[PDB]
Amino acid sequence: ASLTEIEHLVQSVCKSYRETCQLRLEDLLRQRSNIFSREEVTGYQRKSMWEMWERCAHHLTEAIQYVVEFAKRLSGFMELCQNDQIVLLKAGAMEVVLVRMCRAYNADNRTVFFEGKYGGMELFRALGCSELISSIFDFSHSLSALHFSEDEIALYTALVLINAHRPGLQEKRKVEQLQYNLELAFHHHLCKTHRQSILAKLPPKGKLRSLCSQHVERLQIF
């Protein structure tokens, strides 16, 4: 690569993400005072466990649609094999969705956006795994504690998928090359932004996996 490709790619990554940022950040924060009420909350609480889990899967799956198309615009991804273009997504794509959830997270009230409004963890009282839900909130918290920006998201999220160490890969070299020119662009852009400090304030590599992995297993009931 070259000093300019280095820039060209970040911009290209900041490009692809913007198209796939699912929701307008602009519109997101604006809806602060729009908060659920006890009755509606008490309403949502009432439904059986069978309903919410599915309701979640809607917002979930639909969100993951964006995550995939994000992967495409990226260089070298297109010139990758059929078998190997999926393997990463299998593990990766789930994890990224959770990452984007931080945007819908406000630490000033411990709530997350959902179905038009913001709501606390008690909105999922009916899921029977309060511990699970909470850990996700605690994950979002740490990310909100990072005061994260769009263009680092685009760059973090990208490396999640491009893990050449995801087992089941056949064309292993080609991906590492994508990874190397991705690992570089991130830090490089971070160094250009002096945000290298948060790199020690980042989740361990096993946490987000252990989150999503153990997350989907309970879901693998439906």
The 3-state DSSP class for residue 36 equals: coil
| Residue count, binding to ligand 6Q5 (CB under 6 A) | 17
The region of 79-87, 99-107, 154-162, 195-203 touching ligand 6Q5 under the rule CB under 6 A is 99-107
Of the ranges 55-63, 160-168, 183-191, 204-212, which one interacts with ligand 6Q5 (CB under 6 A)?
55-63
Name residues contacting ligand 6Q5, limited to 58-77 (CB under 6 A). 59-60, 63
Q: Is 114 one of the binding residues for ligand 6Q5 (CB under 6 A)?
A: yes
Neighbours of 89 (CB within 10 A): 16
Q: Does 216 bind ligand 6Q5 (CB under 6 A)?
A: no
Smaller CB separation from ligand 6Q5, 119 or 169: 119
100 binds ligand 6Q5 (CB under 6 A): yes
Binding flag, residue 153, ligand 6Q5 (CB under 6 A): no
Alpha carbons 80 and 124: distance in angstroms, whole number = 40
Q: Phi then psi for 35, rounded to 5 degrees? A: -125, 140
Residue in the block written with tokens 């799956």:
61
Candidates 174, 208, 131, 185; CA nearest to 5 is: 185
Alpha-helical (H) ranges within the chain are 3-19, 25-30, 38-46, 49-72, 82-100, 130-144, 150-161, 172-193, 205-219
Q: Report the interface residues with ligand 6Q5, using CB under 6 A.
A: 22-23, 56, 59-60, 63, 97, 100-101, 103-104, 112-114, 124, 133, 136
